Amino acid sequence: TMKVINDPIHGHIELHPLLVRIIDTPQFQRLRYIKQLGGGYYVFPGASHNRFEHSLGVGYLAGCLVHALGEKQPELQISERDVLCVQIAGLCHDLGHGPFSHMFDGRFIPLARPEVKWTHEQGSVMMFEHLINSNGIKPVMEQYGLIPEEDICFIKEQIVGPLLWPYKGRPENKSFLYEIVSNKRNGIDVDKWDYFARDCHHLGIQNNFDYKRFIKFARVCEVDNELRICARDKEVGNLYDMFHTRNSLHRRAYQHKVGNIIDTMITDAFLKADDYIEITGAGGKKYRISTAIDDMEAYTKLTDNIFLEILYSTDPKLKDAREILKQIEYRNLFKYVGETQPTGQIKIKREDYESLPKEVASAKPKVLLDVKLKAEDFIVDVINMDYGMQEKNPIDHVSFYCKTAPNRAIRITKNQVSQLLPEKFAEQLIRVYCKKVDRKSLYAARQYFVQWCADRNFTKPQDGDVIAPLITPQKKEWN
Amino acid sequence: MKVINDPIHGHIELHPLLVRIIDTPQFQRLRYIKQLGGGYYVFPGASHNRFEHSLGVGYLAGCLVHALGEKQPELQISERDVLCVQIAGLCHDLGHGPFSHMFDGRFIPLARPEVKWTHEQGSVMMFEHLINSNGIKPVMEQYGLIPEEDICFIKEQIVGPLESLWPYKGRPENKSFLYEIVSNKRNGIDVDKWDYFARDCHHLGIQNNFDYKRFIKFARVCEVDNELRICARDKEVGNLYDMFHTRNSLHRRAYQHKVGNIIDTMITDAFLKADDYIEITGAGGKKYRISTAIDDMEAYTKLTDNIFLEILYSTDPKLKDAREILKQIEYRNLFKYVGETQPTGQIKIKREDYESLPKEVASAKPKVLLDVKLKAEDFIVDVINMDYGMQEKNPIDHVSFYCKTAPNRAIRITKNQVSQLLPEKFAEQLIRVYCKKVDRKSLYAARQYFVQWCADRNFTKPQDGDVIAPLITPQKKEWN
Amino acid sequence: TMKVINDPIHGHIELHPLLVRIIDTPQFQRLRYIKQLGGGYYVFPGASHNRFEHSLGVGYLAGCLVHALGEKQPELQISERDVLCVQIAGLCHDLGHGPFSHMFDGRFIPLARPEVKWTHEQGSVMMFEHLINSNGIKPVMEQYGLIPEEDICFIKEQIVGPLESLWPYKGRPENKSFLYEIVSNKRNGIDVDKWDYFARDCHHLGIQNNFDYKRFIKFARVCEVDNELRICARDKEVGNLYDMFHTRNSLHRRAYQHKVGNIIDTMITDAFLKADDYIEITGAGGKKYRISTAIDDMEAYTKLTDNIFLEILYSTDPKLKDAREILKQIEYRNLFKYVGETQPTGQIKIKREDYESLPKEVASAKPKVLLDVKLKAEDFIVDVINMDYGMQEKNPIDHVSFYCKTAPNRAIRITKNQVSQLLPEKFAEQLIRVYCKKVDRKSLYAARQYFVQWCADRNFTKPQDGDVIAPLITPQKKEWN
Amino acid sequence: TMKVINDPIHGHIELHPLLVRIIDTPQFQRLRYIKQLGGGYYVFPGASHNRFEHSLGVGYLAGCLVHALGEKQPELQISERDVLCVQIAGLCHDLGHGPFSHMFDGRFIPLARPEVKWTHEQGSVMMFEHLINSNGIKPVMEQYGLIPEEDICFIKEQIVGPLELWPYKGRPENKSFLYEIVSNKRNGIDVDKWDYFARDCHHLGIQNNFDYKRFIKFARVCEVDNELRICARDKEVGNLYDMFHTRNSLHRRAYQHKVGNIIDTMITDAFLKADDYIEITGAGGKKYRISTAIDDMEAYTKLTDNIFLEILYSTDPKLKDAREILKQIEYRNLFKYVGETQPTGQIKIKREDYESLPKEVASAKPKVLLDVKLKAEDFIVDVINMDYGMQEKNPIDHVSFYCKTAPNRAIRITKNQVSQLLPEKFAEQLIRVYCKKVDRKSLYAARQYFVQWCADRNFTKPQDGDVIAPLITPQKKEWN
Ligand SMILES: Nc1nc2c(ncn2[C@@H]2O[C@H](COP(=O)(O)OP(=O)(O)OP(=O)(O)O)[C@@H](O)[C@H]2O)c(=O)[nH]1
Ligand SMILES: Nc1nc2c(ncn2[C@@H]2O[C@H](COP(=O)(O)OP(=O)(O)OP(=O)(O)O)[C@@H](O)[C@H]2O)c(=O)[nH]1
Ligand SMILES: Nc1ncnc2c1ncn2[C@H]1C[C@H](O)[C@@H](COP(=O)(O)OP(=O)(O)OP(=O)(O)O)O1
Ligand SMILES: Nc1ncnc2c1ncn2[C@H]1C[C@H](O)[C@@H](COP(=O)(O)OP(=O)(O)OP(=O)(O)O)O1
Ligand SMILES: [Fe+3]
Ligand SMILES: [Fe+3]
Ligand SMILES: [Fe+3]
Ligand SMILES: [Fe+3]
């Protein structure tokens, strides 16, 4: 018999016994102890929510969309085997997030182990494998009409993409299934739909996107010898508004100036603690925080706990790390100086991130300073805001249909919709913070920053005339 | 005080003066005029009326002004000022006609092209009539108001100045910020917007993406060019662009909905045909028509959405033409939507030319075999200006800001200082074409005329263009 | 192709072309011009909502429940014909409400025409018939696999119950009795009509709703009970079901029976009574009908909506001056003043017969206090209100069937004692509100003295404000100390 | 300058710098790592929320109510000193909850240390003292016009009641109403309840049926027995009974959920087995156990929900028993629910007897021969008191009311004056029985023992009784 569970976002979800069996494992219940928004909780006090319930919701919506397409179009021959596989993918899609979610794969691992190219998705695949094997799920999958050989590939492929037609999990006549959980084509997936609704509910922001409606106007059509999901022509407006809502949530919440500084501070503390924390892995081998990603039995035990483990410890080897975390409780955070963007089409490459603190200290502002500041005193945080496909417009990669010809797929350009849409679909934000908190050093930092902006032909800080009044007239372009 | 439970704002308190204004035929009239006019016939939640909107705007006016006063005693905002602002907010949409914006936006312009009339002008006149016919002046005095000065101040909040130096007679320059609460002439950020965002969304079935409460917490008065004006915090600039995005989005989805607009035009059409034969008793018994009731307020008091059902239920054969249009709305034989398009380059379609556009569509000679030829009277062309409230201008360039480090120092934030993902332009035109003939044969024809007319004038390709007129879209070199 | 419509309560509903065809008729679109809560809008300024959108929602939820039972239990053999019929019933279930909804069938018609036993439901049946015939729907029903003979009966029967211990229904057999429990549940009162208006009225009123209809649907199930297949809820839901009827009673207390909402209802009713004689409405073949007689002809009743309020208000006919003056008094807010509320004691039920006489009794009281003014019986209004759990004195949960996790086909009963000691002792009571037509300071004081005496005179409960309003009278009663 | 913070329940709260200074301490930020609903998260997956944000909201609402009374009634002379003190009390009121909130003070401490009478409130007082002293707050209180001698007593007194005629040393009798805001000893109507109703509902997935904002608009201070206390308007009496109904309803659906409670008992069980082998560093480095950390606040500061994962992740073999219970929660091999029952007549089960009830269930001799016999250690009996917050009393009989006609005159409203459909009693007991042995054979047995035990003690028939134990239910004459 089905099991019913009450999510505050989606209401009463039914869970197929196979799903319940996957959910009730240490690998999945692990997600109860990892917050969705990482350090965001320390700015938005509503945002206590964890991956566990997000993972449930994504599984649910995956089920909704695939099941809806099947009702709408029997010709597709979507089996309850396909449905289950899509649900399972959705359910397990973020199994591989680290402590504090995106802080881990986005800040920490890149710093701790620059050699590796590792993502939360790759983790999810490996963790899924470990979940299946350590809990004897293969027999249960068979019991409910699945074929582990084919289907475990199909599930993995939904999550990370592919391990001519690149997929071994399903044929070309069911390519639409790959667009549900994690849409490689345009980015419109149920992952987004859940976290919009969920993050908004818990943050204290209202969500401007109706996933239910998009489902009612979704439909599979042939596009280039392949069956893919298409939206109705009228929905094009709502789809641009979906990616606006995404970018807006990043601006207000996910990339919040203090949320990000807390993320960097927690990352900093992890880096200092990494050497002295051991985690028992497979066959008892000892793994560090940074190396737990290599073994899943170890990574199973690596959660937000590691924060409090560091905070509460008395090991003097951890004193450096513990002091950073104590500074977060007391709220002696590194101080925000200002924000800026590049101009023209000057993209700042990732390689150069290391060097930018040096450049800020190196500026010679024509103003008398009390204090000189070294490059180690500065933090520069570079942030790429986009519409999910770097410089591309994702709507140019969406297929549409008309009321008059619902099997005929078409394209809608930007010009066909509106002149009030974005000109570009990607940019960079550069936040500068200063490690020295005091009145004297903050004034100095501001002068260095606003000069550095003029030095590199960046945009004038919004507060620029106030914070560095002596420096802003210098630039001819700012008048 | 009197407490009243609005579903949007919760439990509002109402000052006895306000209650006394509310309980008048001129104000209770707003119970019988829907917010979204013909929108109710597309969004079945949107039953809501001006009455409750008017309450909410009054409330939020009170919130903002009272908040500024707490935050900044130096401004010397009196409870007299507060009441006046509340009253303005309360009465700000007293002058909407039947079906709200349909009246001042479609009907009056067609019925009486000579007049320049707006719902605001109506509100001023209706306010005057309310005060005089209900003996409010004594009550205003009783609660510390000065009718001479203050009734001007209230009117001025609603319509702007009643005539580069200081244009207002109601209040001096050191209280200019008060004029920015109810109806903000500078940039358009007002509590009118804040209520109807929340309200329309609640009733429509759309979620609202703008937090008015938050903006209030980061609002503040500063000196700007020898004048004290409301300023928002530097960080809020993002949310302010998102306010006008939310506005434009609501127009796209709801207010300018293709069918909502065709129902508006159909009701307007029926009013035009009924205008000659409907009398409304005015002041001293003089007889006024639907189009002329705006001249007298005693008559206009009785002019509400009722006029729809009056026409529908009538048996006067003089009204048969009008009644038949309205019966066609019940049965849902609406004029059929053909498609939408925009001009290209910077080709603005002037208002003057609106009359002529049906002629142009019929005039197109599509290279396709048609069953039926269609005359210009068969077409309706509906031109819609979508903007950020200041025609082609960026309203954020007309907002003043402050910093945490210097909260009395006002500043400007340009577009470039915020984001590269903002809109390039801040106004555009949408051209919807509909056909009066509903049948399968005439609709196909209409589509061919339309898609040709688009290629003929170098307009954008209709989104559905390759489907509806497959033979015509390859013709244009620019569409490949 | 289906048509999609965005209701703020239920989201994006799909509408089957047959339903759309029924919706787009003058008989149905009529419901756009009748408010859900009648005079409640004049107290809760959110409550602008109309029957139209309620009717949509009830149709939708009817579809949800029946479609859900079918997925859960294929053995029931619920056809898409059955589904459509249930949706249509739900959609059309309140087609027959009058102007200001329950004011019409509940106050006005009983006063205007005491001879008739008429309800909004009976109206809906007749109006449904008129809708079908005047719009040629029968052919369209056939086109989508319905059988008008059988099914139009089934639809009517869902709305009003049986059209007259054997099986009473001619529309469907006993093996599909569960279908009759969806739209309007004669057994216990748990229906989708309630579920919509809870959610809807709350949304528009400014009150939060404490009942989850979606959840009850997930734990609904058909079982055999006494040679008949009926809907049963899971044993654990029993708590939520008592809370459903609590939520109902709570909404009546706060909103539907609000002291001022009711006085405005009586005032509008009063104005209609005075206007009835002089308002004509064109009916079938042009025959002239009055407000009170429009219920006899549906072509006339089609044109009878909340409009009739504004028609009276805006008129200049001097025959309507009495009616127009009452309605003008509502604009200006010179309402009849509330004096207080009371209940009977013991097991003293006040019969409907006696309602006429109660104003006489209040004036007749001789309070031992010096009054400036004597008041006549015509000056008083007494409004008697029956608050119940939908089955007069009965506990509706004693008429619900339940199932267990361990035996989901075996139906059972759950008594009150098996659930909780904190449940209600009784399931019906009476509320008596007294108002005075004379508004002034002097007459209101007098009215209060008459009322609080009348309460002591008939061994009713002490008014909550009693010691304040009539301080000289409350010590008189030995039972109040 | 004030600090603004965005709570999803209450919106944008302003925080006074003194409050911010209290919030940013290890003693307060500790509450980020303690869930509101303890083990409820393992049944309601929305309920991730923690005490931290609850504590914020209670502080906020405390501010709202006290500030509202002050505006409504200047005669009370409520100082911004009083306001701050009330806010601080509200903010810090649940500073002393243990790991998994009510599991700690309600299940664990009573079992681990039966000698002590300890509550989360007593903890909050001690933790407040530790917060103030370890962070040098006293100087800051003085800086914002407080008097630490008087006011720190007043704050503590708000939380726990009197620290020893008028019982309070913190404030005089003419400000007794202030003690009714944060934690209302008289009737239980406090802002603590108002927040968690709204908050728990938001996160659980249940809609809340109580409007705190409205009650505030109709709240008022009147004299009652030589003392100034908060009174509600006569009409609100209905809503107040509905407040305590909503409370009881939330306990039934959520807080006392059969599985939520079994997970609480299982976590408690694991803590008991782990208690001996877990050390926590306290003041001057002294070693404290989980059960003894309550004696020292420096230790208790580090005692949070963490202790769950500490046990789960450990490899110490001394903790193997505890770790195995917690692993059984992940895998979902929970102790199985057998059924629920209530006593009859006026048979109250005293707390003393709780220990003995498993013995009694095993001791029942059900007249059908059972293939496995079960020992008393195999059973868990969970006794739950559901009340209206004052044991057997009606809390509305301890509320004061006022009338529109006489707003300074306080009165009483009995049950009979309101409704015949109200509850007959205001307290009852629920007895849940679970079995530690999970298997098919032992569960059948357990059911037979339970349903017999019910008939043996003249308890109510289990709702599922005829199904689970069909052979036993006809035995009882009273069940037919
Ligand atoms: N048909 C109908 N639609 C309504 C009603 N109320 C709101 N609507 C909405 O208005 C939308 C569009 O109106 P329609 O009558 O369908 O006009 P259309 O969409 O241009 O035309 P078709 O879809 O071809 O019939 C519908 O899809 C409904 O969601 C109603 O009473 N009847
Ligand atoms: N101080 C503090 N702020 C919090 C906390 N939790 C969330 N916040 C929010 O985080 C926001 C910003 O963090 P702050 O600590 O104020 O950092 P900041 O604003 O950059 O620094 P200041 O302006 O100097 O206070 C605040 O407005 C709060 O609403 C907390 O525990 N302490
Ligand atoms: N229980 C309730 N919950 C929420 N709102 C209510 C409730 N009862 C009434 N309202 C609404 C209707 C109005 O918007 C406002 C005032 O109603 P109410 O409390 O009955 O006072 P009232 O003005 O009718 O009587 P009074 O003159 O006795 O204050 O609150
Ligand atoms: N754009 C936003 N919309 C809604 N809520 C927000 C937004 N930004 C922040 N919040 C929330 C998170 C915080 O709890 C609160 C205040 O945050 P924020 O406005 O960023 O001020 P801050 O304290 O971080 O910087 P500052 O010290 O400059 O005010 O509101
Ligand atoms: Fe995800
Ligand atoms: Fe307005
Ligand atoms: Fe109904
Ligand atoms: Fe609390």
Numbering used by the authors:
A (entry chain B): 114 to 276, 284 to 599
B (entry chain C): 115 to 277, 283 to 599
C (entry chain D): 114 to 277, 283 to 599
D (entry chain A): 114 to 277, 284 to 599
Question: What are the paper's exact sentences on this?
Answer:
Sterile alpha motif and HD domain-containing protein 1 (SAMHD1) is an important regulator of cellular 2′-deoxynucleoside-5′-triphosphate (dNTP) in mammalian cells. Although the HD-domain contains the active site, dNTP hydrolysis requires assembly of SAMHD1 into homo-tetramers. Here, sequences at the N and C termini of the HD-domain stabilise inter-monomer protein–protein interactions and incorporate four pairs of allosteric nucleotide-binding sites, AL1 and AL2, which regulate the enzyme through combined binding of G-based (AL1) and 2′-deoxynucleoside (AL2) triphosphates. Using combined biophysical and X-ray structural studies incorporating nucleotide analogues along with mutagenesis experiments we have now discovered that SAMHD1 uses a bi-metallic Fe–Mg centre to catalyse dNTP hydrolysis in a reaction similar to those catalysed by HD domains in both human and bacterial phosphodiesterase PDE enzymes.
In addition, we determined the structures of two co-complexes of wt-SAMHD1(109-626), also in the presence of Mg2+, with (i) GTP (AL1), dATP (AL2) and dCMPNPP (active site) and (ii) GTP (AL1), dATP (AL2) and TMPNPP (active site). dATP was added to the latter two complexes to stimulate tetramer assembly, as dCMPNPP and TMPNPP are poor AL2 activators. Further investigation using inhibition assays revealed that all dNMPNPP analogues were actually competitive inhibitors of SAMHD1-dNTP triphosphohydrolase activity, with inhibition constants (Ki) ranging from 0.78 µM for dAMPNPP to 0.052 µM for dGMPNPP, with the following rank order of increasing affinity: dAMPNPP < TMPNPP < dCMPNPP < dGMPNPP. The resolution of these structures varied between 2.0 and 3.2 Å, but all structures contain highly homologous “closed” tetramers of the SAMHD1 catalytic domain, with pairwise root-mean-square deviations (RMSDs) of <0.5 Å across all atoms in each tetramer. In the active site of the dNMPNPP structures, regardless of the nucleotide base, it is apparent that the side chain of Asp311 of the HD motif not only makes a coordinate bond with the bound active site Fe but also acts as an acceptor in a hydrogen bonding interaction with the proton (Himido) of the α,β-imido group of the dNMPNPP.
